[PDB]
Amino acid sequence: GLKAAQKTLFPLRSIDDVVRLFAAELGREEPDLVLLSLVLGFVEHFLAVNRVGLTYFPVADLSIIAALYARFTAQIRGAVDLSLYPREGGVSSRELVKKVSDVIWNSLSRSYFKDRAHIQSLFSFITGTKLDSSGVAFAVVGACQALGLRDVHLALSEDHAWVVFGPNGEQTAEVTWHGKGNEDRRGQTVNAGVAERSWLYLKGSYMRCDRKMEVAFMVCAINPSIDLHTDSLELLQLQQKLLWLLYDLGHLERYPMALGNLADLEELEPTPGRPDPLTLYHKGIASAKTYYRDEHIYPYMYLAGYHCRNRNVREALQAWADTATVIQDYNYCREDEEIYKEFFEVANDVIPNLLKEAASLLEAGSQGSALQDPECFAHLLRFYDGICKWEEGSPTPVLHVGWATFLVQSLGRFEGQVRQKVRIVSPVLTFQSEKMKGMKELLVATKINSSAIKLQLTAQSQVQMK
Ligand SMILES: N#Cc1cc2cc(CN3CCC(Nc4ncnc5sc(CC(F)(F)F)cc45)CC3)ccc2n1C[C@H](O)CO
């Protein structure tokens, strides 16, 4: 509206007053995305961007919030004439969605850093004329809600956002950019990307938000970072409380990554009486398995990161093997570079560092070491198997010799007598990739044949002439 009933909690004088507003809005027929994003962006601005003057909490006065709300609704209602786009069926048209996307896009500053923090909310859009990529999608959905377009909803993958709309909510439209130096496809469907089985479009097993999930998205999108070294405790607490509110109401059920976010927050500062981080990471995975065909990577990455921080080598390795077992059934496509980066960093930085420490601890007499556990070696092998299987049939390769040195080093961290105990069947392990099947022969020698491994991993044909 803003409607009278939306205004009665103001002024918001604390974290808990913000929580009450969210609870009130989530109890309404449709939570007001615009209101909520403006409030979050306001409080984030004054807790993370500019803390000058801060004594407890930046009080959000109704006059201030209502004026920001008015700037937004005036900008959208002025620029989008609904009469030009008649709605057949209580549903929106592709032209209307494109128009709203154009209105948001055309309002943005000409030149700015798109990867900066704190440009996710409608507060940033109004006061800074700046949004990040998924921020533009969210703003399109808020604008559509403000316009009364109840069928337009946010669609999310693990690295991209777009909208669904139309008859049965079955249409897709691009409304923002993706990445850097990719040509935009605004207005188009996502069908080509689904059909090519890229990770970016999750084989169609992406999130189709309802309004409550769009609230969950804006909560996940809070950025407590003040700088590289420092987070706002106030925003961490707000985000954590809002995620628990959403959890209790059922609205994280279909949102794996929100569960991982919440688990990470609980690891940092546990809430008494709540599930442990591990329970929450596993609920995230269960959500992915239940609702999304187990085709998501981050629920497993979140779990592995927790085990890695807690130096639980065995369970970290298991979780990264599970990440690989998901990726193996995708094709590595242009625009998938963010997941390539995750796998690269895990293989070539995180695992090596973990195993280096484990090696030092073994030298010092640790018992029950992952490096003496053939099941742990099997997890390492399954991780590489999935990466190799991912590469099969992909339009672009994954592996190169830059990965090979780290593989040799990681294999070598396990003594031959440990490696010998894994049974590779056509611990027991089965390989899906042809690369790993050919490598089987090399995996039990006391001293690993490094050159032969390299040749098998990169499928390098030849060795040096001279
Ligand atoms: N092991 C491990 C590991 C855990 C881990 C955890 C993260 C944390 N990251 C996980 C993904 C999260 N992303 C999200 N969280 C909630 N909702 C959404 S909707 C969306 C799509 C888009 F942005 F809207 F377009 C993304 C996204 C943001 C936080 C990143 C890399 C991680 N890794 C890999 C590690 O950094 C390798 O160095």
mmCIF file of N, CA and C in Angstrom, residues 15-116:
data_model
loop_
_atom_site.group_PDB
_atom_site.id
_atom_site.type_symbol
_atom_site.label_atom_id
_atom_site.label_comp_id
_atom_site.label_asym_id
_atom_site.label_seq_id
_atom_site.Cartn_x
_atom_site.Cartn_y
_atom_site.Cartn_z
ATOM 1 N N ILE A 15 16.936 -5.109 16.412
ATOM 2 C CA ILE A 15 16.919 -6.375 15.666
ATOM 3 C C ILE A 15 15.601 -7.071 15.858
ATOM 4 N N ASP A 16 15.170 -7.251 17.108
ATOM 5 C CA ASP A 16 13.928 -7.924 17.322
ATOM 6 C C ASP A 16 12.705 -7.218 16.725
ATOM 7 N N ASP A 17 12.694 -5.870 16.656
ATOM 8 C CA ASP A 17 11.613 -5.144 15.961
ATOM 9 C C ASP A 17 11.601 -5.447 14.458
ATOM 10 N N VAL A 18 12.786 -5.603 13.879
ATOM 11 C CA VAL A 18 12.850 -6.024 12.456
ATOM 12 C C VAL A 18 12.254 -7.448 12.296
ATOM 13 N N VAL A 19 12.671 -8.339 13.190
ATOM 14 C CA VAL A 19 12.094 -9.706 13.207
ATOM 15 C C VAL A 19 10.587 -9.656 13.303
ATOM 16 N N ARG A 20 10.022 -8.813 14.195
ATOM 17 C CA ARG A 20 8.576 -8.722 14.307
ATOM 18 C C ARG A 20 7.933 -8.275 12.973
ATOM 19 N N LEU A 21 8.575 -7.338 12.265
ATOM 20 C CA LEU A 21 8.047 -6.908 10.993
ATOM 21 C C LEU A 21 8.017 -8.040 9.986
ATOM 22 N N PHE A 22 9.095 -8.794 9.945
ATOM 23 C CA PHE A 22 9.125 -9.948 9.068
ATOM 24 C C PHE A 22 8.066 -10.984 9.418
ATOM 25 N N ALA A 23 7.855 -11.215 10.699
ATOM 26 C CA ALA A 23 6.850 -12.123 11.110
ATOM 27 C C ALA A 23 5.478 -11.651 10.741
ATOM 28 N N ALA A 24 5.192 -10.359 10.897
ATOM 29 C CA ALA A 24 3.934 -9.819 10.510
ATOM 30 C C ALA A 24 3.703 -9.964 9.034
ATOM 31 N N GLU A 25 4.714 -9.590 8.241
ATOM 32 C CA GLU A 25 4.594 -9.712 6.800
ATOM 33 C C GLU A 25 4.446 -11.152 6.299
ATOM 34 N N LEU A 26 5.144 -12.072 6.940
ATOM 35 C CA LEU A 26 5.034 -13.464 6.505
ATOM 36 C C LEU A 26 3.672 -14.050 6.890
ATOM 37 N N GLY A 27 2.993 -13.441 7.853
ATOM 38 C CA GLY A 27 1.630 -13.817 8.278
ATOM 39 C C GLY A 27 0.564 -13.245 7.376
ATOM 40 N N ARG A 28 0.938 -12.316 6.495
ATOM 41 C CA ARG A 28 0.005 -11.741 5.537
ATOM 42 C C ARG A 28 -0.179 -12.604 4.310
ATOM 43 N N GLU A 29 -1.268 -12.321 3.615
ATOM 44 C CA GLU A 29 -1.615 -12.996 2.403
ATOM 45 C C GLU A 29 -0.382 -13.101 1.490
ATOM 46 N N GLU A 30 0.278 -11.962 1.218
ATOM 47 C CA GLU A 30 1.549 -11.860 0.510
ATOM 48 C C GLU A 30 2.537 -10.886 1.211
ATOM 49 N N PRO A 31 3.686 -11.398 1.688
ATOM 50 C CA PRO A 31 4.629 -10.486 2.262
ATOM 51 C C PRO A 31 5.070 -9.441 1.250
ATOM 52 N N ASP A 32 5.292 -8.206 1.734
ATOM 53 C CA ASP A 32 5.636 -7.098 0.861
ATOM 54 C C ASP A 32 7.120 -7.076 0.667
ATOM 55 N N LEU A 33 7.538 -7.595 -0.497
ATOM 56 C CA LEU A 33 8.952 -7.689 -0.795
ATOM 57 C C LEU A 33 9.680 -6.331 -0.789
ATOM 58 N N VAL A 34 8.999 -5.335 -1.330
ATOM 59 C CA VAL A 34 9.578 -3.987 -1.437
ATOM 60 C C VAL A 34 9.833 -3.397 -0.036
ATOM 61 N N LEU A 35 8.820 -3.460 0.811
ATOM 62 C CA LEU A 35 8.953 -2.993 2.182
ATOM 63 C C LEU A 35 10.128 -3.697 2.823
ATOM 64 N N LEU A 36 10.144 -5.042 2.731
ATOM 65 C CA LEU A 36 11.138 -5.803 3.495
ATOM 66 C C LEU A 36 12.571 -5.584 3.038
ATOM 67 N N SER A 37 12.774 -5.491 1.711
ATOM 68 C CA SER A 37 14.055 -5.236 1.171
ATOM 69 C C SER A 37 14.567 -3.829 1.482
ATOM 70 N N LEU A 38 13.679 -2.851 1.475
ATOM 71 C CA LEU A 38 14.044 -1.493 1.862
ATOM 72 C C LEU A 38 14.482 -1.441 3.334
ATOM 73 N N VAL A 39 13.753 -2.138 4.208
ATOM 74 C CA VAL A 39 14.137 -2.161 5.607
ATOM 75 C C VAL A 39 15.485 -2.863 5.790
ATOM 76 N N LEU A 40 15.684 -4.021 5.155
ATOM 77 C CA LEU A 40 16.958 -4.682 5.306
ATOM 78 C C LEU A 40 18.100 -3.832 4.792
ATOM 79 N N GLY A 41 17.906 -3.193 3.642
ATOM 80 C CA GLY A 41 18.943 -2.396 3.052
ATOM 81 C C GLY A 41 19.282 -1.159 3.852
ATOM 82 N N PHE A 42 18.257 -0.572 4.447
ATOM 83 C CA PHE A 42 18.431 0.535 5.381
ATOM 84 C C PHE A 42 19.266 0.122 6.566
ATOM 85 N N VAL A 43 18.870 -0.952 7.217
ATOM 86 C CA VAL A 43 19.613 -1.373 8.428
ATOM 87 C C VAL A 43 21.030 -1.858 8.062
ATOM 88 N N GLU A 44 21.208 -2.560 6.941
ATOM 89 C CA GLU A 44 22.533 -2.939 6.501
ATOM 90 C C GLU A 44 23.402 -1.731 6.183
ATOM 91 N N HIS A 45 22.835 -0.722 5.535
ATOM 92 C CA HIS A 45 23.606 0.462 5.223
ATOM 93 C C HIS A 45 24.240 1.057 6.518
ATOM 94 N N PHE A 46 23.396 1.196 7.544
ATOM 95 C CA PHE A 46 23.780 1.888 8.789
ATOM 96 C C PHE A 46 24.442 0.979 9.798
ATOM 97 N N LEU A 47 24.543 -0.320 9.493
ATOM 98 C CA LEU A 47 25.326 -1.239 10.288
ATOM 99 C C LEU A 47 26.575 -1.733 9.641
ATOM 100 N N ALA A 48 26.725 -1.667 8.326
ATOM 101 C CA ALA A 48 27.885 -2.195 7.651
ATOM 102 C C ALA A 48 28.538 -1.188 6.719
ATOM 103 N N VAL A 49 27.781 -0.325 6.071
ATOM 104 C CA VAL A 49 28.381 0.617 5.114
ATOM 105 C C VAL A 49 28.868 1.878 5.813
ATOM 106 N N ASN A 50 28.026 2.468 6.635
ATOM 107 C CA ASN A 50 28.364 3.677 7.408
ATOM 108 C C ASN A 50 27.835 3.564 8.837
ATOM 109 N N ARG A 51 28.730 3.231 9.750
ATOM 110 C CA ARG A 51 28.434 3.127 11.171
ATOM 111 C C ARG A 51 28.710 4.387 11.986
ATOM 112 N N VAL A 52 28.935 5.487 11.308
ATOM 113 C CA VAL A 52 29.126 6.730 12.036
ATOM 114 C C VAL A 52 27.946 7.100 12.831
ATOM 115 N N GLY A 53 28.133 7.324 14.119
ATOM 116 C CA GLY A 53 27.020 7.737 14.903
ATOM 117 C C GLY A 53 26.274 6.593 15.552
ATOM 118 N N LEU A 54 26.594 5.383 15.191
ATOM 119 C CA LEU A 54 25.842 4.236 15.680
ATOM 120 C C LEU A 54 26.035 4.107 17.188
ATOM 121 N N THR A 55 24.946 3.930 17.935
ATOM 122 C CA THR A 55 25.037 3.675 19.365
ATOM 123 C C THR A 55 24.431 2.364 19.790
ATOM 124 N N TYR A 56 23.485 1.827 18.994
ATOM 125 C CA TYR A 56 22.877 0.532 19.310
ATOM 126 C C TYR A 56 22.301 -0.065 17.998
ATOM 127 N N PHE A 57 21.354 0.626 17.410
ATOM 128 C CA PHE A 57 20.695 0.128 16.238
ATOM 129 C C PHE A 57 20.161 1.304 15.461
ATOM 130 N N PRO A 58 20.275 1.295 14.135
ATOM 131 C CA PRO A 58 19.794 2.430 13.344
ATOM 132 C C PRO A 58 18.270 2.428 13.294
ATOM 133 N N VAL A 59 17.629 3.304 14.012
ATOM 134 C CA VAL A 59 16.201 3.306 14.120
ATOM 135 C C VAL A 59 15.604 3.588 12.727
ATOM 136 N N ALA A 60 14.682 2.733 12.309
ATOM 137 C CA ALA A 60 14.008 2.881 11.028
ATOM 138 C C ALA A 60 12.644 3.494 11.308
ATOM 139 N N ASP A 61 12.573 4.787 11.031
ATOM 140 C CA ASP A 61 11.343 5.538 11.183
ATOM 141 C C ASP A 61 10.416 5.325 9.998
ATOM 142 N N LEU A 62 9.121 5.277 10.256
ATOM 143 C CA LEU A 62 8.158 5.114 9.193
ATOM 144 C C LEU A 62 8.280 6.173 8.122
ATOM 145 N N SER A 63 8.476 7.432 8.506
ATOM 146 C CA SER A 63 8.565 8.471 7.504
ATOM 147 C C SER A 63 9.678 8.191 6.497
ATOM 148 N N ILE A 64 10.841 7.735 6.969
ATOM 149 C CA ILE A 64 11.994 7.442 6.146
ATOM 150 C C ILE A 64 11.699 6.240 5.245
ATOM 151 N N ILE A 65 11.207 5.169 5.833
ATOM 152 C CA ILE A 65 10.934 3.990 5.044
ATOM 153 C C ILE A 65 9.818 4.224 4.054
ATOM 154 N N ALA A 66 8.759 4.915 4.476
ATOM 155 C CA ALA A 66 7.671 5.176 3.578
ATOM 156 C C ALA A 66 8.115 6.054 2.433
ATOM 157 N N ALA A 67 9.049 6.964 2.654
ATOM 158 C CA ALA A 67 9.478 7.831 1.549
ATOM 159 C C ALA A 67 10.285 7.030 0.515
ATOM 160 N N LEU A 68 11.154 6.153 0.990
ATOM 161 C CA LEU A 68 11.904 5.240 0.086
ATOM 162 C C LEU A 68 10.922 4.359 -0.709
ATOM 163 N N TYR A 69 9.906 3.833 -0.034
ATOM 164 C CA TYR A 69 8.877 2.986 -0.662
ATOM 165 C C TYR A 69 8.167 3.744 -1.746
ATOM 166 N N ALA A 70 7.821 5.011 -1.458
ATOM 167 C CA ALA A 70 7.189 5.883 -2.430
ATOM 168 C C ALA A 70 8.065 6.155 -3.596
ATOM 169 N N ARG A 71 9.364 6.303 -3.420
ATOM 170 C CA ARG A 71 10.253 6.555 -4.561
ATOM 171 C C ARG A 71 10.231 5.338 -5.479
ATOM 172 N N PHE A 72 10.222 4.158 -4.876
ATOM 173 C CA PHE A 72 10.212 2.937 -5.690
ATOM 174 C C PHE A 72 8.929 2.752 -6.434
ATOM 175 N N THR A 73 7.819 2.859 -5.744
ATOM 176 C CA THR A 73 6.532 2.603 -6.411
ATOM 177 C C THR A 73 6.271 3.696 -7.439
ATOM 178 N N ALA A 74 6.667 4.951 -7.162
ATOM 179 C CA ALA A 74 6.497 6.009 -8.184
ATOM 180 C C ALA A 74 7.318 5.725 -9.431
ATOM 181 N N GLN A 75 8.546 5.241 -9.257
ATOM 182 C CA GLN A 75 9.406 4.973 -10.381
ATOM 183 C C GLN A 75 8.805 3.846 -11.251
ATOM 184 N N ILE A 76 8.245 2.816 -10.612
ATOM 185 C CA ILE A 76 7.737 1.670 -11.390
ATOM 186 C C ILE A 76 6.388 1.996 -12.012
ATOM 187 N N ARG A 77 5.472 2.567 -11.233
ATOM 188 C CA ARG A 77 4.135 2.853 -11.734
ATOM 189 C C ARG A 77 4.164 3.904 -12.842
ATOM 190 N N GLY A 78 5.083 4.840 -12.738
ATOM 191 C CA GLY A 78 5.241 5.872 -13.754
ATOM 192 C C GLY A 78 5.757 5.307 -15.073
ATOM 193 N N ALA A 79 6.641 4.300 -15.010
ATOM 194 C CA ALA A 79 7.349 3.851 -16.183
ATOM 195 C C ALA A 79 6.676 2.657 -16.853
ATOM 196 N N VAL A 80 5.863 1.930 -16.121
ATOM 197 C CA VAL A 80 5.182 0.726 -16.652
ATOM 198 C C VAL A 80 3.660 0.982 -16.665
ATOM 199 N N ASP A 81 3.138 1.238 -17.840
ATOM 200 C CA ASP A 81 1.724 1.383 -18.035
ATOM 201 C C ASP A 81 1.110 0.031 -18.332
ATOM 202 N N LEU A 82 0.430 -0.518 -17.335
ATOM 203 C CA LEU A 82 -0.199 -1.807 -17.450
ATOM 204 C C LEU A 82 -1.248 -1.937 -18.526
ATOM 205 N N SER A 83 -1.856 -0.813 -18.923
ATOM 206 C CA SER A 83 -2.872 -0.838 -19.973
ATOM 207 C C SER A 83 -2.328 -1.239 -21.328
ATOM 208 N N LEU A 84 -1.013 -1.117 -21.526
ATOM 209 C CA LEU A 84 -0.376 -1.460 -22.777
ATOM 210 C C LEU A 84 -0.145 -2.966 -22.876
ATOM 211 N N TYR A 85 -0.352 -3.674 -21.751
ATOM 212 C CA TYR A 85 -0.047 -5.117 -21.585
ATOM 213 C C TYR A 85 -1.192 -5.862 -20.901
ATOM 214 N N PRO A 86 -2.323 -6.008 -21.595
ATOM 215 C CA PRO A 86 -3.518 -6.554 -20.929
ATOM 216 C C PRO A 86 -3.250 -7.953 -20.376
ATOM 217 N N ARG A 87 -3.726 -8.253 -19.167
ATOM 218 C CA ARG A 87 -3.479 -9.567 -18.576
ATOM 219 C C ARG A 87 -4.625 -10.530 -18.847
ATOM 220 N N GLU A 88 -4.370 -11.496 -19.720
ATOM 221 C CA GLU A 88 -5.280 -12.611 -19.920
ATOM 222 C C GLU A 88 -5.006 -13.655 -18.844
ATOM 223 N N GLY A 89 -5.954 -13.852 -17.930
ATOM 224 C CA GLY A 89 -5.976 -15.037 -17.055
ATOM 225 C C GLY A 89 -5.483 -14.846 -15.637
ATOM 226 N N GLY A 90 -5.398 -13.585 -15.215
ATOM 227 C CA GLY A 90 -4.674 -13.225 -14.026
ATOM 228 C C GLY A 90 -3.189 -13.534 -14.179
ATOM 229 N N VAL A 91 -2.697 -13.628 -15.430
ATOM 230 C CA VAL A 91 -1.251 -13.862 -15.660
ATOM 231 C C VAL A 91 -0.604 -12.876 -16.628
ATOM 232 N N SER A 92 0.713 -12.724 -16.460
ATOM 233 C CA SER A 92 1.491 -11.757 -17.115
ATOM 234 C C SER A 92 2.041 -12.259 -18.447
ATOM 235 N N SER A 93 2.397 -11.329 -19.306
ATOM 236 C CA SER A 93 2.978 -11.612 -20.589
ATOM 237 C C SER A 93 4.485 -11.404 -20.601
ATOM 238 N N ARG A 94 5.151 -12.022 -21.578
ATOM 239 C CA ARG A 94 6.567 -11.887 -21.704
ATOM 240 C C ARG A 94 6.974 -10.435 -21.938
ATOM 241 N N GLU A 95 6.164 -9.711 -22.708
ATOM 242 C CA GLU A 95 6.435 -8.293 -22.989
ATOM 243 C C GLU A 95 6.411 -7.439 -21.743
ATOM 244 N N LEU A 96 5.465 -7.729 -20.881
ATOM 245 C CA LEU A 96 5.348 -7.005 -19.601
ATOM 246 C C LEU A 96 6.549 -7.285 -18.728
ATOM 247 N N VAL A 97 6.928 -8.564 -18.607
ATOM 248 C CA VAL A 97 8.112 -8.894 -17.824
ATOM 249 C C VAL A 97 9.353 -8.220 -18.354
ATOM 250 N N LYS A 98 9.535 -8.222 -19.670
ATOM 251 C CA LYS A 98 10.658 -7.535 -20.291
ATOM 252 C C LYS A 98 10.635 -6.042 -20.022
ATOM 253 N N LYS A 99 9.459 -5.439 -20.057
ATOM 254 C CA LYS A 99 9.333 -4.021 -19.782
ATOM 255 C C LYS A 99 9.792 -3.728 -18.361
ATOM 256 N N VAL A 100 9.374 -4.529 -17.418
ATOM 257 C CA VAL A 100 9.778 -4.255 -16.035
ATOM 258 C C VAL A 100 11.277 -4.428 -15.855
ATOM 259 N N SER A 101 11.841 -5.456 -16.509
ATOM 260 C CA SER A 101 13.265 -5.666 -16.492
ATOM 261 C C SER A 101 14.023 -4.466 -17.088
ATOM 262 N N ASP A 102 13.528 -3.950 -18.231
ATOM 263 C CA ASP A 102 14.104 -2.781 -18.843
ATOM 264 C C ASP A 102 14.068 -1.550 -17.935
ATOM 265 N N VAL A 103 12.951 -1.382 -17.217
ATOM 266 C CA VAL A 103 12.805 -0.244 -16.307
ATOM 267 C C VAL A 103 13.856 -0.305 -15.225
ATOM 268 N N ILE A 104 14.061 -1.475 -14.637
ATOM 269 C CA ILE A 104 15.099 -1.595 -13.618
ATOM 270 C C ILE A 104 16.510 -1.375 -14.169
ATOM 271 N N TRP A 105 16.811 -2.097 -15.232
ATOM 272 C CA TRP A 105 18.106 -2.022 -15.895
ATOM 273 C C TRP A 105 18.446 -0.590 -16.297
ATOM 274 N N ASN A 106 17.511 0.085 -16.941
ATOM 275 C CA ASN A 106 17.754 1.444 -17.444
ATOM 276 C C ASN A 106 17.933 2.485 -16.320
ATOM 277 N N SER A 107 17.554 2.146 -15.090
ATOM 278 C CA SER A 107 17.682 3.057 -13.947
ATOM 279 C C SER A 107 19.062 2.972 -13.311
ATOM 280 N N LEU A 108 19.847 1.977 -13.654
ATOM 281 C CA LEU A 108 21.126 1.742 -13.008
ATOM 282 C C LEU A 108 22.196 2.704 -13.486
ATOM 283 N N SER A 109 23.083 3.064 -12.568
ATOM 284 C CA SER A 109 24.285 3.831 -12.910
ATOM 285 C C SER A 109 25.027 3.185 -14.045
ATOM 286 N N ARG A 110 25.605 4.056 -14.872
ATOM 287 C CA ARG A 110 26.250 3.668 -16.111
ATOM 288 C C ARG A 110 27.480 2.803 -15.889
ATOM 289 N N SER A 111 28.221 3.086 -14.823
ATOM 290 C CA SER A 111 29.509 2.469 -14.609
ATOM 291 C C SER A 111 29.645 2.290 -13.124
ATOM 292 N N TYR A 112 29.844 1.045 -12.688
ATOM 293 C CA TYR A 112 30.137 0.750 -11.286
ATOM 294 C C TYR A 112 30.650 -0.661 -11.139
ATOM 295 N N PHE A 113 31.209 -0.967 -9.970
ATOM 296 C CA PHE A 113 31.705 -2.327 -9.699
ATOM 297 C C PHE A 113 30.550 -3.238 -9.286
ATOM 298 N N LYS A 114 30.262 -4.225 -10.129
ATOM 299 C CA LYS A 114 29.042 -5.034 -10.000
ATOM 300 C C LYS A 114 29.162 -6.095 -8.936
ATOM 301 N N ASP A 115 30.393 -6.366 -8.508
ATOM 302 C CA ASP A 115 30.746 -7.410 -7.542
ATOM 303 C C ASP A 115 30.917 -6.844 -6.138
ATOM 304 N N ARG A 116 30.592 -5.581 -5.927
ATOM 305 C CA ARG A 116 30.769 -5.072 -4.588
ATOM 306 C C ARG A 116 29.680 -5.509 -3.632
#
